[PDB]
Amino acid sequence: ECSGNLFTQRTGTITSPDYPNPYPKSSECSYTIDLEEGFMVTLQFEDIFDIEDHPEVPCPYDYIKIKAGSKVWGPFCGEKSPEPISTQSHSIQILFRSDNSGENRGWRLSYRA
Ligand SMILES: [Ca+2]
Numbered sequence: 001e002c003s004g005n006l007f008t009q010r011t012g013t014i015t016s017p018d019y020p021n022p023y024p025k026s027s028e029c030s031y032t033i034d035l036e037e038g039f040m041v042t043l044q045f046e047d048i049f050d051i052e053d054h055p056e057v058p059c060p061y062d063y064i065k066i067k068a069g070s071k072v073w074g075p076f077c078g079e080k081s082p083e084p085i086s087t088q089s090h091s092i093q094i095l096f097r098s099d100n101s102g103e104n105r106g107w108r109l110s111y112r113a
Contacts, residue, residue: 002017002027002028002029003029005032006034007032010112010113011110012033012110013110014108014111015108016107016108019106020108022103022104022106025101026099026100027062027097028096029096030094032091032093036090039090040087040088040089041089041090041111041112041113042086042087042111042113043084043092043094043109043110043111044084044110045081049076049079049081049082050079050105050106051063051064051077053077053078053079058077059078061099062096062097063097064077064095064107065096066085067095068088068092068093071088073085094109
């Protein structure tokens with residue numbers, strides 16, 4: 001269970017469950033950053049980024065996705081750390097899902113506004 005996290009503080013670090021040890025199978029995590037309008041969240045991935053991938057199909061197993069307003073970043077998977085995100089928004093949703101197999105260390109991000 002890792003759904004429904006709500007953060008109203010302007011700074012923080014968020015990680016996949018158990019990071020940097022492997023995240024659970026069948027994860028459905030969600031984290032919402034809810035700040036006053038006018039604040040603009042910037043997000044950066046840190047340290048090891050390792051989400052299961054596939055050689056031909058883009059992120060079919062596990063992935064992180066970020067939404068703010070109408071804008072969507074990702075899904076992201078694999079070993080490459082996504083580029084930093086300037087969301088231009090005060091209300092961000094970070095979603096992570098995993099399937100029922102594999103072994104990958106997950107992700108770490110920090111945010112500021
Ligand atoms: Ca997996």
